[PDB]
Structure formats: C-alpha cells, structure tokens
Design a protein around this ligand. Structure first.
Ligand SMILES: NC(=O)[C@H](Cc1ccc(C2=CC(=O)NS2(=O)=O)cc1)NC(=O)[C@H](Cc1ccccc1)NC(=O)Cc1ccc(C2=CC(=O)NS2(=O)=O)cc1
Ligand SMILES: CCCCCCCCO[C@@H]1O[C@H](CO)[C@@H](O)[C@H](O)[C@H]1O
Length: 286
C-alpha cells in the first residue's frame, strides 16, 4: 500500500464527512440489508434465552451448543471469506445463559472474548457479569461442567485486559482465555478516539485471539450488533487492505452488507459507520 492509496482514502473520508453523507449511506445499508428466517430463536422455549425480541440470530448462521437438550444461544457466526476470518457475535449473556456462553467458548475453541459494553447501561443490567471478581476469582456455572478462574486483571483508562483459566471439570483440561473489555464505549455511540480503539484492536490481534490457529473470537456488547459490528467491520476492512493488490478498492458498504448476511443490524448508527471508516484509514497507516 503506497501513499496514493492513503491519499485517496483520506480524501474520500474528508469528502463524505464534510458533506455529512454518512446519513444517506447508512440509510441505504439499512434499506438493502438482507433478511433470513430466525425460526429457532423465536421458539417459545427459547424466550428466556433472548435479551431483545428484535435481535435474533438467523437460523443459517447461528452457533449451536453441542448439548442435545436445547442447543440454542443468541449468537451468530460471521464468516468473512476473502478476509479469511471468523467471528462469533453474541448478545450480552443473561444471568441464565452465562453457562451457555462459556460452553460456546469451550466448544468453539475460542482464545479471546471481546466485551464492548458495560454491565449496567442506562440504569439496567445489559450484561450479566460472567467473569470473576477479585474477591471470588472462582466460578462454577450451574448446569455445566465448567470452572472459571481470574488469573490476572489489568485495568487501564479505556479498557481492561484479563487472563482467565477455563477448565472442563470432567476432563480436567484447562485453557487460557483472554478477556478484552473496552470499558468506555457508550451505547449507540463511538470510542473516545480512533487511537484508543486501534490500540485495543491491535492488543487483541497481538494476543493471537484472532488467528486461525484458535477458534473464532467471541465479540459482544449488549445486543451484539452495534458496537460489536463496528469492531468487526474495522478489523475486517483492515484485513482486506493488507491482502488486496489495491487497498483503495475496499467497499465499506459492500463489506458491511456481507457481514449483515450473517447477523442482523450490524452497526447501529451513522456515526458508528463513520467511526469504522475512520478507524480503518487511521489503522492502515500502521
Ligand atoms: N432496538 C433496541 O434499542 C433494543 C435492542 C438493541 C439494544 C442495544 C443495541 C446496541 C447499540 C450499540 O451501540 N451496541 S448494541 O448493544 O448492539 C442495539 C439494539 N430492543 C428493544 O429495546 C426492544 C424493544 C424495541 C423493539 C424494536 C424497536 C425498538 C425497540 N426491547 C426488548 O426486546 C425487551 C424485550 C424482550 C423480549 C420481550 C418478549 C416478547 C415475548 O413475546 N415474550 S418476552 O420474552 O417477554 C419483551 C421485551
Ligand atoms: C473502510 C475504508 C474504505 C476506503 C475506501 C476508499 C476508496 C477511495 O475511492 C477513491 O477516492 C478518491 C478521492 O475521493 C476518488 O477520486 C476516486 O475516484 C475513488 O475511487
């Protein structure tokens, strides 16, 4: 990628931004977004497994738990072919689905978990605390054979990184799970700056949590679509620029619509779309 690519990219952002065109672009994405059945998510017995009735995983891409009783979890597999990366986007676990959440992490062989929301937002519980606190580092999930222990916790200004140990109580196998928690990303909003977001994304990448040597990273916010979608779109577009002969050929609208074939509503505001674009052009420099 040469300087002319950077030039066109930056000029384009400026042109879109100065004319406030994000609004129209975002509307077109919403208007063209695909729709597929969500029959399983809507089954009566799955009512208490969904945080929002208007946010469901499509049947074709939903993540199935390996258990036979009820394999449903509100989670979707976002598989980006050209970029060669898979992500699992899920809702913030409910108190009764924290076990399911870790069963998914175990079954999919994930190494990292990216959390982009806070436990309480706008006065209500938007995500059950599914990881241990300092005073009780050990957790055992009801109706599961999984134990979770907090090994380390590093609290920074805009995010916190944790090392966790997940253990299968039946086989005694233990695995290191990295928790990347962005603690200052407002609901329906954007990160404080492209720099903070990029530092976070790069930290996730450097850990190996996004490598094909491990299962798909699990990403979530409250509904698993707005902030989670922004995070994944930026990472994927960055991947495409590093792989393509001509990085300026990346079509952000096309890429987002492709991701939306896997999970509904990815990116919830025009400003989040704008931020994704900004994060990509800023990250392209690195
Ligand atoms: N759309 C939204 O803002 C959020 C989801 C939403 C939340 C957050 C975000 C995020 C922004 C972000 O930046 N990141 S993010 O976390 O992804 C995006 C979307 N959805 C809602 O608030 C909807 C009510 C609604 C429906 C349609 C349109 C508007 C409101 N509320 C519910 O679904 C609660 C509810 C769930 C099940 C039932 C039930 C029906 C039933 O039949 N039985 S029941 O279980 O009681 C009844 C109520
Ligand atoms: C997510 C980041 C996507 C970056 C895609 C940038 C595509 C640049 O596109 C180019 O921008 C130039 C400057 O306006 C125009 O003159 C060119 O005709 C146009 O093809």
């Amino acid at each position: 990628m040469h300087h002319h690519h950077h030039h066109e990219m930056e000029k384009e952002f400026e042109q879109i931004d100065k004319s406030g065109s994000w609004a129209a672009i975002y509307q077109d994405i919403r208007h063209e977004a695909s729709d597929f059945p969500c029959r399983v998510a809507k089954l009566p017995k799955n009512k208490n497994r969904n945080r929002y009735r208007d946010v469901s995983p499509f049947d074709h891409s939903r993540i199935k738990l390996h258990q036979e009783d009820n394999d449903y979890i509100n989670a979707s597999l976002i598989k980006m072919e050209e970029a060669q990366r898979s992500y699992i986007l899920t809702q913030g676990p409910l108190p009764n689905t924290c076990g399911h959440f870790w069963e998914m992490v175990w079954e999919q062989k994930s190494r990292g978990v990216v959390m982009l929301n806070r436990v309480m937002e706008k006065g209500s519980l938007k995500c059950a605390q599914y990881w241990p606190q300092k005073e009780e580092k050990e957790m055992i999930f009801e109706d599961t054979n999984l134990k979770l222990t907090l090994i380390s916790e590093d609290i920074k200004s805009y995010y916190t990184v944790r090392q966790l140990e997940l253990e299968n109580l039946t086989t005694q196998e233990t695995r290191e799970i990295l928790h990347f928690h962005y603690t200052t990303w407002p609901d329906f909003g954007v990160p404080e700056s492209p720099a903070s977001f990029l530092n976070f994304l790069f930290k996730v990448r450097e850990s190996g949590s996004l490598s094909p040597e491990h299962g798909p990273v699990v990403v979530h916010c409250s509904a698993g679509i707005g902030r989670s979608g922004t995070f994944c779109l930026a990472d994927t577009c960055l991947l495409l620029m590093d792989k393509r002969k001509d990085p300026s050929s990346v079509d952000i609208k096309k890429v987002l619509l492709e991701m939306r074939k896997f999970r509904m509503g990815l990116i919830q505001t025009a400003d989040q779309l704008r931020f994704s674009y900004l994060a990509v052009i800023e990250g392209a420099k690195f």
